[PDB]
Design an enzyme around this catalytic site. Sequence first.
Site, PDB file in Angstrom:
ATOM      1  N   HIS A 142       0.851  -1.199   0.000  1.00 42.94           N
ATOM      2  CA  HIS A 142       0.000   0.000   0.000  1.00 42.94           C
ATOM      3  C   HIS A 142       0.891   1.254   0.000  1.00 42.94           C
ATOM      4  O   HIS A 142       0.718   2.180  -0.799  1.00 42.94           O
ATOM      5  CB  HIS A 142      -0.916  -0.029   1.235  1.00 42.94           C
ATOM      6  CG  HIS A 142      -1.677   1.233   1.478  1.00 42.94           C
ATOM      7  ND1 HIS A 142      -3.055   1.292   1.428  1.00 42.94           N
ATOM      8  CD2 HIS A 142      -1.259   2.476   1.814  1.00 42.94           C
ATOM      9  CE1 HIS A 142      -3.450   2.524   1.692  1.00 42.94           C
ATOM     10  NE2 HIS A 142      -2.378   3.262   1.933  1.00 42.94           N
ATOM     11  N   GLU A 143       1.864   1.267   0.890  1.00 43.88           N
ATOM     12  CA  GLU A 143       2.730   2.420   1.015  1.00 43.88           C
ATOM     13  C   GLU A 143       3.583   2.610  -0.257  1.00 43.88           C
ATOM     14  O   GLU A 143       3.654   3.712  -0.792  1.00 43.88           O
ATOM     15  CB  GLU A 143       3.598   2.292   2.261  1.00 43.88           C
ATOM     16  CG  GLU A 143       2.832   2.071   3.585  1.00 43.88           C
ATOM     17  CD  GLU A 143       1.849   3.176   3.953  1.00 43.88           C
ATOM     18  OE1 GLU A 143       1.690   4.162   3.204  1.00 43.88           O
ATOM     19  OE2 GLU A 143       1.232   3.053   5.031  1.00 43.88           O
ATOM     20  N   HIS A 146       1.776   4.191  -3.126  1.00 41.73           N
ATOM     21  CA  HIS A 146       1.713   5.663  -3.098  1.00 41.73           C
ATOM     22  C   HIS A 146       2.853   6.271  -3.914  1.00 41.73           C
ATOM     23  O   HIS A 146       2.673   7.292  -4.571  1.00 41.73           O
ATOM     24  CB  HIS A 146       1.779   6.213  -1.665  1.00 41.73           C
ATOM     25  CG  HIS A 146       0.482   6.127  -0.924  1.00 41.73           C
ATOM     26  ND1 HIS A 146      -0.720   6.475  -1.498  1.00 41.73           N
ATOM     27  CD2 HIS A 146       0.198   5.752   0.344  1.00 41.73           C
ATOM     28  CE1 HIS A 146      -1.691   6.299  -0.624  1.00 41.73           C
ATOM     29  NE2 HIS A 146      -1.160   5.872   0.505  1.00 41.73           N
ATOM     30  N   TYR A 157      -3.701  14.417  -2.430  1.00 36.84           N
ATOM     31  CA  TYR A 157      -4.166  13.675  -1.265  1.00 36.84           C
ATOM     32  C   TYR A 157      -5.271  14.431  -0.509  1.00 36.84           C
ATOM     33  O   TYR A 157      -5.121  14.781   0.666  1.00 36.84           O
ATOM     34  CB  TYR A 157      -2.975  13.346  -0.366  1.00 36.84           C
ATOM     35  CG  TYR A 157      -3.161  12.123   0.492  1.00 36.84           C
ATOM     36  CD1 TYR A 157      -3.171  10.853  -0.074  1.00 36.84           C
ATOM     37  CD2 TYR A 157      -3.307  12.234   1.876  1.00 36.84           C
ATOM     38  CE1 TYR A 157      -3.329   9.726   0.714  1.00 36.84           C
ATOM     39  CE2 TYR A 157      -3.466  11.114   2.668  1.00 36.84           C
ATOM     40  CZ  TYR A 157      -3.474   9.865   2.081  1.00 36.84           C
ATOM     41  OH  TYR A 157      -3.632   8.750   2.863  1.00 36.84           O
ATOM     42  N   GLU A 166      -5.771   6.641  -2.125  1.00 37.49           N
ATOM     43  CA  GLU A 166      -5.902   5.602  -1.111  1.00 37.49           C
ATOM     44  C   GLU A 166      -6.401   4.251  -1.648  1.00 37.49           C
ATOM     45  O   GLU A 166      -5.855   3.182  -1.302  1.00 37.49           O
ATOM     46  CB  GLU A 166      -6.820   6.130  -0.004  1.00 37.49           C
ATOM     47  CG  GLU A 166      -6.053   6.882   1.027  1.00 37.49           C
ATOM     48  CD  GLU A 166      -4.985   6.001   1.650  1.00 37.49           C
ATOM     49  OE1 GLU A 166      -5.314   4.875   2.099  1.00 37.49           O
ATOM     50  OE2 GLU A 166      -3.815   6.400   1.669  1.00 37.49           O
ATOM     51  N   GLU A 177      -0.573  -8.912  -2.013  1.00 39.90           N
ATOM     52  CA  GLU A 177      -0.835  -9.964  -1.036  1.00 39.90           C
ATOM     53  C   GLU A 177      -1.275 -11.281  -1.716  1.00 39.90           C
ATOM     54  O   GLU A 177      -0.833 -12.362  -1.334  1.00 39.90           O
ATOM     55  CB  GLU A 177      -1.877  -9.495  -0.024  1.00 39.90           C
ATOM     56  CG  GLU A 177      -2.071 -10.468   1.089  1.00 39.90           C
ATOM     57  CD  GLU A 177      -3.004  -9.937   2.139  1.00 39.90           C
ATOM     58  OE1 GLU A 177      -2.768  -8.806   2.611  1.00 39.90           O
ATOM     59  OE2 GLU A 177      -3.976 -10.653   2.502  1.00 39.90           O
ATOM     60  N   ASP A 226      -9.806  13.877   7.981  1.00 35.84           N
ATOM     61  CA  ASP A 226      -9.071  12.890   7.171  1.00 35.84           C
ATOM     62  C   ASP A 226      -8.859  13.376   5.730  1.00 35.84           C
ATOM     63  O   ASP A 226      -9.069  12.627   4.775  1.00 35.84           O
ATOM     64  CB  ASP A 226      -9.810  11.549   7.207  1.00 35.84           C
ATOM     65  CG  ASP A 226      -9.074  10.451   6.472  1.00 35.84           C
ATOM     66  OD1 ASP A 226      -7.831  10.401   6.548  1.00 35.84           O
ATOM     67  OD2 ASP A 226      -9.745   9.626   5.822  1.00 35.84           O
ATOM     68  N   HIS A 231      -9.394   8.050   3.542  1.00 33.29           N
ATOM     69  CA  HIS A 231      -9.453   6.645   3.979  1.00 33.29           C
ATOM     70  C   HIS A 231     -10.877   6.159   4.250  1.00 33.29           C
ATOM     71  O   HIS A 231     -11.077   5.011   4.676  1.00 33.29           O
ATOM     72  CB  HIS A 231      -8.644   6.432   5.262  1.00 33.29           C
ATOM     73  CG  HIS A 231      -7.217   6.862   5.156  1.00 33.29           C
ATOM     74  ND1 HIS A 231      -6.795   8.138   5.470  1.00 33.29           N
ATOM     75  CD2 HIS A 231      -6.106   6.178   4.786  1.00 33.29           C
ATOM     76  CE1 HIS A 231      -5.485   8.223   5.285  1.00 33.29           C
ATOM     77  NE2 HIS A 231      -5.044   7.045   4.879  1.00 33.29           N
TER      78      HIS A 231
HETATM   79 CA   LIG Z   1      -4.994  -8.150   3.478  1.00 31.28          CA
HETATM   80 CA   LIG Z   2      -4.119 -11.666   4.590  1.00 29.97          CA
HETATM   81 ZN   LIG Z   3      -2.306   5.277   2.108  1.00 34.76          ZN
END
Ligand SMILES: [Ca+2]
Ligand SMILES: [Ca+2]
Ligand SMILES: [Zn+2]
Length: 316
Positions: A142-143, A146, A157, A166, A177, A226, A231
Amino acid sequence: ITGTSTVGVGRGVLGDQKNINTTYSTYYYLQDNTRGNGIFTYDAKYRTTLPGSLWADADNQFFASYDAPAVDAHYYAGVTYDYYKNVHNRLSYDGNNAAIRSSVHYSQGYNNAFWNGSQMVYGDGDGQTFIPLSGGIDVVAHELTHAVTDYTAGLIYQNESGAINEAISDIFGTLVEFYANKNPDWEIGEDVYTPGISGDSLRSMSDPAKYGDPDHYSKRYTGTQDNGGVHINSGIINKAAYLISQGGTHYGVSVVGIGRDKLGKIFYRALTQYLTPTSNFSQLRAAAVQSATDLYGSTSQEVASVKQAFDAVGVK
Ligand SMILES: [Ca+2]
Ligand SMILES: [Ca+2]
Ligand SMILES: [Zn+2]
Ligand SMILES: [Ca+2]
Ligand SMILES: [Ca+2]
């Protein structure tokens, strides 16, 4: 540093053993010379100075509890790099093998992680809300995603453009994953969130409302918290992405799933070809429809399903 490429071994945040590419010159450094211009992992030593010190180890074995966040940040950066290269033919985040830098043990009991425009940064968590955040492969991807966004669409953002930003990170974090085949799911941060509670996560893509996030445009957050709900409203796009991949019915709108590989291709094309810094949800729909059209043809099932997925979440 200058040295020779070596391979060490250690334990991650979840107690899993894995090999890591290192560099030897007096010490063994967390420096993987096999991926692009290298993957470098740093110790922030509980401070907020960045990057900290390049991670150095006397024996190339990384089994101390202190080592664990470093092992995972380093390892999962490599996996994410492999994903982008093998799946999208993208060489690191800039498409030119840019060096990837991560810092762990950032601050004290810090319940977050981020891409700061230059590098990834991981807190250790307070041991209640989180364990060290690099222990989550979706979190790391995820990071890193970005960074991919920074160099492609450049989505601001804030508000709808920030929510798409996001969602893009959640989508590719999840696709990474699944790519690793490491207990994959459509939830975010389940491996590092709340060690006292099984079965929960930070966010759900398959059912964002599980954790209070909107799953339809009519339910979007309109306030200023936020960064305008980046998010929060990411739920609407995450739901759309889930539906495109997996299909299903949602607010009485039926979606035929086209699978993860095609979701990835369509959103990667959207991100790299059509999205802009100020794209809103409506423009994301158009970008995703156009991308699916480029790839599979305008009368394809793939295009039909993108339209149906966005219909389902009330985004026209
Ligand atoms: Ca997951
Ligand atoms: Ca998982
Ligand atoms: Zn993020
Ligand atoms: Ca050691
Ligand atoms: Ca938990």
